[model samples]
Target: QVKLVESGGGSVQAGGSLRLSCAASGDAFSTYFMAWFRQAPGKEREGLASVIPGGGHTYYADSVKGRFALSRDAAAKTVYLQMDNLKPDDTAMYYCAARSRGGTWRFLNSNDYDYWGQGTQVAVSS
Candidate 1:
């Protein structure tokens, strides 16, 4: 079965930066577009932002502005999402989402998201 695994330990200091990765196995990694999702704790899906790492373009949803980044490691078959200048508000679940059928837009914008990874919880403090 196909799966995405987030790499790294939990915990980040305030004002610091972080880079998280979602490594994929069981299929060709180059055939799909990866997306990043930001969901606040105890809150429903908060569509903070998304990006097409292959093209280095970002689409910020809900007026989010910050030093967030998304990139893909083609050689390692992993999709990476990064954020800089961590704040308490930055503490949330970051998910590495992908498309299994191949589409450019999301369901919130349309009605899709056939592929999704297990959520990664990041807590910022100290």
Candidate 2:
């Protein structure tokens, strides 16, 4: 079946940086914003950051902003998430989210996750 695959690192340390990539073999990337999220093995979900359309500046979620970014490559039609200034608490699985909006930033409200990435696993160490 068609799926979204994330290619990035999971091992990070406090004060380090990491960048992840998400690529889908379907009609998903060309329609949504490449979003990022954080989740533990068994816990609630959290939004770390998001990348705007056309590789624009990242809109972080308070403490989750600054060091994280979402990027896209038109040539490859792939989305990317870069998480810098890593902290141990930032250790979790990251994901790339997308929605079917036909190349529109469909973030009408900052409530639910309109789209989602495949997910990047970030395991931080001291």
Tell me, by TM-score, which candidate is best: 1
Q: After superposition, how far is residue 12 of candidate 2 from its true place, in Å?
A: 1.9
Q: What are the per-residue Cα lDDT tens digits for candidate 1 across 6-112?
A: 76537899988888888888667776666767678687676555555364666766544657766777888887767788888878887766665654656333235
Residue 34 in model 1: lDDT: 67
Runs in model 2 lying further than 4 Å from the true structure: 55-57, 102-118
Q: Report lDDT (CA) for all predictions.
A: 0.69, 0.66
For every model in order, what is the number of clashing pairs?
2, 8
Candidate 1's C-alpha runs over 4 A off are 53-56, 62-66, 102-111
lDDT per residue (tens digit) for residues 47-114 in model 2: 66655555556566786656776677866877777778888878777666655444433342334545
Which 10-residue window of candidate 1 scores lowest in summed lDDT?
102-111
Q: Name the lDDT value of residue 51 in candidate 2.
A: 58
